[PDB]
Design a binder for this molecule. Structure first.
Ligand SMILES: CC(=O)N[C@@H]1[C@@H](O)[C@@H](O)[C@@H](CO)O[C@H]1O
Ligand SMILES: CC(=O)N[C@@H]1[C@@H](O)[C@@H](O)[C@@H](CO)O[C@H]1O
Ligand SMILES: [Ca+2]
Ligand SMILES: [Ca+2]
Lengths: 138, 138
């Protein structure tokens, strides 16, 4: 429900959402907490246009090769899904993914995974940047 | 997931969605079918900014005093909710609404209901304009 003018300074507008591409260095759980500290949440990716919007941003730098996003293995439902509890619609796994290690998802840029989703086994101690999202739904 | 440039000609952009404010004259069921004919669906209103975007458009004319939207009494769940099966989040009923007549929802402009939701008892034979939505989720 966001418009351009709704995005906080340093956030980017796409597709009714505002996004923060945060260059800090945290674990997945740390990253979830960080986005919450901004009245926001790790990004959820509902469609291929949003997937490609994200890829366009991550592809414009080369320093970092993964960014945490808002999905992880879900014990209750026994699947990977968004942290808001909603199942995947768009499917964005890279070649050969998921490994099914009951881990946490990132966009990964490694070998044949070209800014596509990977499940990483370590939700705690693997430090990287992250992507937060708001949709101004109020 | 829509951007401005994604909206078909005659549709309007707001908040990641494209909207058709169609001035044809159909019943609610007719209106649901019409939006489907456009690879689209009667509008669902997830937030107060989208509610007010819609109000801004409907308020700019005076000929019509109601427009069909994508919600109706749901037999299974025994409530009013969106036709996509999802429950209300934003609550947009006008003063004194719902009547609880197990009907179909419109934006209504009548007496103290000032372009806010009403439940109309007749889902079939009450002819009016409607609001279709796409979110380009592909
Ligand atoms: C943080 C991240 O995604 N790391 C991935 C890892 O999970 C593994 O999939 C590997 C190939 O064995 O590529 C990595 O560098
Ligand atoms: C189409 C529509 O919403 N019509 C509403 C009707 O449902 C009723 O609520 C009435 C007041 O009794 O206002 C009407 O004209
Ligand atoms: Ca999203
Ligand atoms: Ca909507």
């Amino acid at each position: 429900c966001c418009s351009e003018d709704d995005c906080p300074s340093g956030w980017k507008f796409f597709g009714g959402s505002c996004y923060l591409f945060d260059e800090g260095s945290r674990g997945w759980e740390g990253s979830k907490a960080f986005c919450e500290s901004k009245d926001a949440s790790l990004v959820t990716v509902e469609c291929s246009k949003e997937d490609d919007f994200i890829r366009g941003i991550l592809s414009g730098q080369t320093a970092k090769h993964y960014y945490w996003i808002g999905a992880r293995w879900n014990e209750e439902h026994n699947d990977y899904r968004w942290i808001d509890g909603s199942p995947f619609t768009f499917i964005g796994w890279g070649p050969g993914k998921p490994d099914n290690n009951k881990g946490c998802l990132d966009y990964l840029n490694y070998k044949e995974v070209v800014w596509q989703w990977n499940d990483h086994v370590d939700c705690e101690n693997t430090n990287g940047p992250c992507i937060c999202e708001i949709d101004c739904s109020d």
